[PDB]
């Protein structure tokens, strides 16, 4: 018999992004080919199967720095980190291959699906 | 020129609630008349003007325990904590006064508005 507030999830995510932009309560640095990205472990886990596995590990959960595979493109990661905090994906002809490869590595199934569909349309 | 995934914010919140239910990466205990509630500081800040003010304070941001005002009802708090993580509010005739008072204290403007409207309908 609950009532539901339609915009609540969107409003929560908007505030989480405001905390990220002001670097408030960020608890991890993600290192991608020397580029560094500050984020909230909980948001990363909520969006990515790879971060979920990393931060539920009894040893890795305590790390303040996570280094990604050297093949990961920093721009692809940045676009995906923006998507995690906003639901908006900046998908372009020039970045789609790097975005799909990063989403496959991060285990972000819905992003992988839209990239596959956009690539299939261009062939 | 971004694309947007409609269900992303809802999916993020659902995963944050799954982390709460398994007590994963919770970083604060909220004490309400001896009852204790574990939560994520970021989610509390994203939902409440009071928690936002508390955890942006240079001294309070580092506290692992927050004690609420003794007038706060633990059931009212529990209903609101569930709303923060799910967008669902368990509003009932028997709890509406405690829920409205707790939402006013927590500075959760949308909850206060729906309680005021539901109370006005009953008079």
């Amino acid at each position: 018999s609950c009532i539901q507030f339609t915009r609540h999830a969107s409003d929560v995510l908007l505030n989480l992004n405001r905390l990220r932009s002001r670097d408030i309560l960020t608890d991890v640095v993600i290192v991608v080919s020397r580029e560094q990205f500050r984020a909230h472990k909980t948001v990363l886990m909520a969006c990515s199967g790879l971060f979920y596995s990393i931060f539920t590990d009894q040893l890795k959960c305590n790390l303040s720095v996570i280094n990604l595979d050297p093949e990961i493109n920093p721009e692809g990661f940045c676009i995906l980190l923006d998507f995690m905090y906003t639901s908006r994906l900046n998908l372009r002809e020039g970045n789609i291959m790097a975005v799909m490869a990063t989403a496959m590595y991060l285990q972000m199934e819905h992003v992988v699906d839209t990239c596959r569909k956009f690539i299939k349309a261009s062939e | 020129s971004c694309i947007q995934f409609t269900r992303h914010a809802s999916d993020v919140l659902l995963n944050l609630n799954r982390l709460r239910s398994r007590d994963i990466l919770t970083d604060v205990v909220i004490v309400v008349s001896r009852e204790q509630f574990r939560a994520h500081k970021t989610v509390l800040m994203a939902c409440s003007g009071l928690f936002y003010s508390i955890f942006t304070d240079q001294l309070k941001c580092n506290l692992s325990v927050i004690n609420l005002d003794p007038e706060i009802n633990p059931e009212g708090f529990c209903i609101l904590l569930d709303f923060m993580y799910t967008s669902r509010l368990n509003l009932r005739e028997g709890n509406i006064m405690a829920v409205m008072a707790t939402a006013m204290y927590l500075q959760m403007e949308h909850v206060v508005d729906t309680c005021r409207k539901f109370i006005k309908a009953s008079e």
Binding site: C2, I3, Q4, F5, T6 | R88, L89, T114
Partner: peptide
């Protein structure tokens, strides 16, 4: 607010 809605009935979910």
């Amino acid at each position: 607010w809605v009935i979910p």
